Amino acid sequence: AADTPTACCFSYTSRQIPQNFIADYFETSSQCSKPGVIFLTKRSRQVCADPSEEWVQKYMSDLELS
Amino acid sequence: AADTPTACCFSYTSRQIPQNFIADYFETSSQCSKPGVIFLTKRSRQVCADPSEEWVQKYMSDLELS
Numbered sequence: 001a002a003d004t005p006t007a008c009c010f011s012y013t014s015r016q017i018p019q020n021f022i023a024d025y026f027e028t029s030s031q032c033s034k035p036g037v038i039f040l041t042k043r044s045r046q047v048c049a050d051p052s053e054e055w056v057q058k059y060m061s062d063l064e065l066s
Numbered sequence: 067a068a069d070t071p072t073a074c075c076f077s078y079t080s081r082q083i084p085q086n087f088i089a090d091y092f093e094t095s096s097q098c099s100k101p102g103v104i105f106l107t108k109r110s111r112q113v114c115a116d117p118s119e120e121w122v123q124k125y126m127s128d129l130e131l132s
């Protein structure tokens with residue numbers, strides 16, 4: 001779809017999510033005031049995270065290279 | 067939940083949704099650049115709409131008074 005809500009982050013998790021919790025991720029629209037990475041856990045919980053944090057660039061890379 | 071994505075509207079539907087399509091609604095965070103009403107249809111499609119439009123204030127009222 002399209003013309004439909006877009007997810008935005010207004011706060012970032014403060015602590016590193018354990019990596020084996022992570023099932024997927026995506027980056028939030030550039031239309032959002034903040035840059036965001038939303039991780040999806042295995043229980044399908046969505047979690048906002050700061051793209052400029054080392055551990056999140058880690059998790060993104062590991063996810064992409066598999 | 068909380069610390070999790072928030073829905074934002076960046077465009078509004080251009081045409082009035084038929085009222086019998088509507089199943090629910092909510093208003094988007096004041097943190098979003100735009101004011102928004104998101105209608106949920108019976109097929110669970112989410113639809114962004116302009117709160118300053120007469121027909122959407124209509125639909126909100128009708129939904130609340132039932």
Ligand SMILES: [K+]
Binds near residue numbers: 030031032033034
């Ligand atoms: K921006």
Ligand SMILES: [K+]
Binds near residue numbers: 096098
């Ligand atoms: K605002």
